[PDB]
Design a protein around this nucleic acid. Structure first.
Lengths: 83, 109, 76, 96, 98, 97, 111, 99, 80
DNA sequence: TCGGATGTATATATCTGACACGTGCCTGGAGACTAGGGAGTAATCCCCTTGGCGGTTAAAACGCGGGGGACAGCGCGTACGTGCGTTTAAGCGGTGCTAGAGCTGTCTACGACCAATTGAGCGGCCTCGGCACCGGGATTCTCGA
DNA sequence: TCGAGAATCCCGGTGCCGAGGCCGCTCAATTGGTCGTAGACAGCTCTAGCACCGCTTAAACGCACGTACGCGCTGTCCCCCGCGTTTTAACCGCCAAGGGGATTACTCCCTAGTCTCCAGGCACGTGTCAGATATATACATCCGA
């Protein structure tokens, strides 16, 4: 089934909470769309690499190892999920 | 006759497996031949680093009056030491969190 | 109009196109009359390289023009 | 019907932990984190040693390659202490 | 008559509370749907392991937190308290990203 | 007098240059730069292919690993054109004998 | 028992880069236990394509400034003006290259 | 009366002239002396090939030029025209070099 | 040996001018000198480590390139 | 400058699922022996590094006048934080089902290895044309009135 | 608005050195043949990923109100910029001496490969206590007065 309009699932309070953890105090009213765009770009890159990796292995299920390798390839290594 | 077996780790007085490290070095496609002294050095270095991190994390855990170690304690131990922080500058730890800092300007008058 | 195009072999060949003719159809006609594939060659008029989607009307190429023809050898 | 064998660094990490803090346990996720850390450091050092051996038109990796790789990778005090530990371990092994 | 806090107190309270904890902040199902829709463009009829989704969520959240920290520093540098889009743009430009 | 031989990519680079731009020279510094560029790209692709082969517990390097590494390293249009060129070259080599 | 005339492997594929040298470098470079019979051809083709592209752009840059030879400045200008090539060589500095001629708009004189 | 340019013209002229060319900008001998003095600490009685000094000079100049560009952007972001040390500090902090 | 003073003020001004700066304050020079010293310290330490391992007495152009590449600052055109 | 209301930290019962430990066993590590090539060591050659002296001339250093930019203070109006009532879907607990991951046999086509040999590529020479340099005139700007 | 000085570019003539091409030869890529095993294909078993249905309640949404902060404007003072004069040391050319990098030959010994044997580490099952919840209470902190 084709999905559409899911970028709006990232609600404004969630971005507010992330900023609060980051240490911000006051937020302007135009930040949310920019944050959505940035997150979209990052996810596109990582998912592209992971799908290439799972394609090479002649599989059809994306495994955690593919995500770990894709993240490591860009110098953003992640600890706690194997490998 | 034959003598009783003694592990190489026991000879070197270590707690990490020398033979396994030797096998991994041989099968990892690093060089044509592997000397007989590299595994001991590598095992010693790995043991030292592990002991350092574990001691710091255990201190942090005992600070928060708890008996076990959870990833937050590891993150606190790593991020509060200069050289360890520099060694792991591009690594994210799951379930870690952040360091509680607030800029001085934002504080109330 | 009529154009004269010289190649790297020192030979000049006449060419009959219109000012609004794009380089795609000109290349196709040159291939028909010579056998040279359209994508293997590239042309200079007055020190400027042509564009496949462009024509000679915007490129200001008229009758009795002199163009330089240089090979682009590519493939496997 | 039993599964295959998966290698890990479990026993040695637990032994070292009991050696340092005798009355402290550890949970599973921190354990996986430590396993990944050990593997990553091992890979970094081994790769540096292999490149160093290649540069010099030599076909074997010895203790000197490991020592120089350790000096190149780690910061100052960690490098000094690790070098001391490694040379002590190698000498003790060779003596017996 | 009703007791109201002056503007700024609850912000600091939230800062402390959310810097004391470790749990995830973005909800699960919207993130999963977003991941599936994004991945749809590369190969149709794909399937995912749950740990893969969890790893993606953790990495993305860490990246966003670091970016917001740098953005706050940039905003503070110019005698301001409120962050604005140009701060995000400048931080991303300096970090070395297109 | 005894002198050790040194290998380089100078002659092939010059052949390509004369193939694309018939009348154009090149100085020594540019040739050194091109040599370094070729060596760097070769190392990157070979290392990526080796790691990829090691992940799937296989002991051989084939054309599939090279294709996947090329698709992973380069940006979009360059990747597409390079993949096309490589496949054409392999087909032409296999056909002839 | 008459051996035939030797033909280079590069000639069969219609290439210019050396297939045999690349095959030897792959075998002796400690990458895997065994190397297939198709990897060197692919690698040679890819390297040839990249070199040809960069050389074409640099030659255009050199011709622009009324010169018949290529110098490092022309290579730097060719690389830094194409977005994909600039992305590829993101963290590489070229000796005797220089910088692109830009000026921030605010610094320009008023009126 | 002597003919003087308004403050600012010669700066732009120097900008154009210096980013049109491709030479080195620091005198060779003082740089060589500095390199030798820096290296003296780690090991005594060292010797240097000329190409090594040249490579070090080129790398240092490229690094400094890039840092100055980032500093200028930081300075402009705050509605100023003059660069100041705090801009350099902020650029280095964001880049991830300073701890 | 105060050789750090050999980096004259006009040289720093020229570097900034090529970088694109129009106005310079009066305290940039000390910061520039410190930054340059730190960078040179790191690179030369790595190069000397390589040279010492190679069992030699003169640093070569090659190990400078190796040290630069180790820090993700590759350099082209010096026999790499 | 005090005082009331709110949020946060502190003390106690309690019950559940994860951590620590005991077993069997089987596969990986150790003991003993050979044989062969990689690496240590000594001697030799000569190239490139360091060191010194004279000049000359461009670049660095110093002083001065002044205009433009950095910075503090004021006023205004608007965008954002706080609180409250209503609406929405996320989260949890089950029940089905099957597509596909993971393991086992076997069998052949593909890559490593060896001996003979010949042509591609590298080092040394040399010759001349493209580019660097110098002097002069036309052009394009900037600043004061 | 307009015109006198400076700085830049276009053109022509001259000379030098490194870029492009030619020879000779030695080492490495070809050709032809054999052998062993890595992986490709077929078959089977069982797990976990996807789909659905119901209920509860916590979170997201929308609205009203007030206030503190972002931004423009003015004024002042001082500190870099552009220019002229004096001082200095960087660069170029040339000459001497010798240390250490780069080869070449010789020899001993450290490591890969093979066979036999056995005990260390991993999968599986079981129990109990460290900690997460819930409840109550005491204390620190903020905003008008």
């Amino acid at each position: 089934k084709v999905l559409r309009d899911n970028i709006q699932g990232i609600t404004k309070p969630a971005i507010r909470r992330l900023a609060r953890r980051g240490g911000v105090k006051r937020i302007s009213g135009l930040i949310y769309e920019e944050t959505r765009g940035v997150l979209k770009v990052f996810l596109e890159n990582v998912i592209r690499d992971a799908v290439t990796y799972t394609e090479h292995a002649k599989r059809k299920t994306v495994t955690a190892m593919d995500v770990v390798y894709a993240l490591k390839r860009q110098g953003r290594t992640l600890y706690g999920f194997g490998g | 006759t034959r003598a009783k077996a003694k592990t190489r780790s026991s000879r070197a007085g270590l707690q990490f497996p020398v033979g396994r490290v030797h096998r991994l070095l041989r099968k990892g496609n690093y060089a044509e031949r592997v000397g007989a002294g590299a595994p001991v050095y590598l095992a010693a270095v790995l043991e030292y680093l592990t002991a350092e991190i574990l001691e710091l994390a255990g201190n942090a855990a005992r600070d928060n009056k708890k008996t076990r170690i959870i990833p937050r304690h590891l993150q606190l131990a790593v991020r509060n030491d200069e050289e360890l922080n520099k060694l792991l500058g591009r690594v994210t730890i799951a379930q870690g969190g952040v360091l509680p800092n607030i800029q001085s300007v934002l504080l109330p008058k | 109009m009529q154009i004269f195009v010289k190649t790297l072999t020192g030979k000049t060949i006449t060419l009959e196109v219109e000012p609004s003719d794009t380089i795609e159809n000109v290349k196709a006609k040159i291939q028909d009359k010579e056998g040279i594939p359209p994508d293997q060659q590239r042309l200079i008029f007055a020190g400027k390289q042509l564009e496949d989607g462009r024509t000679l009307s915007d490129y200001n190429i008229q009758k009795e023009s002199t163009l330089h023809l240089v090979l682009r050898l590519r493939g496997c | 019907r039993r599964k295959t064998r998966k290698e890990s660094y479990a026993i040695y990490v637990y032994k070292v932990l009991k050696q340092v803090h005798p009355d402290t346990g550890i949970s599973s996720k921190a354990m996986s984190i430590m396993n990944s850390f050990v593997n990553d450091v091992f890979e970094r050092i081994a790769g540096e040693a292999s490149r160093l051996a290649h540069y010099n038109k030599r076909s074997t990796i010895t203790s000197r390659e490991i020592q120089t790789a350790v000096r190149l990778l780690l910061p100052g005090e960690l490098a000094k202490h690790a070098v001391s530990e490694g040379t002590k371990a190698v000498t003790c092994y060779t003596s017996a | 008559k009703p007791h109201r806090y002056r503007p700024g107190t609850v912000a600091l309270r939230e800062i402390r509370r959310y810097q004391k904890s470790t749990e995830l902040l973005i909800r699960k199902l919207p993130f999963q749907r977003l991941v599936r829709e994004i991945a749809q463009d590369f190969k149709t009829d794909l399937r995912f392991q749950s740990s893969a989704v969890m790893a993606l969520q953790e990495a993305s959240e860490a990246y966003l937190v670091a970016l917001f920290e740098d953005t706050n520093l940039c905003a503070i540098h110019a005698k301001r308290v409120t962050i604005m889009p140009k701060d995000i743009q400048l931080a991303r430009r300096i970090r070395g990203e297109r």
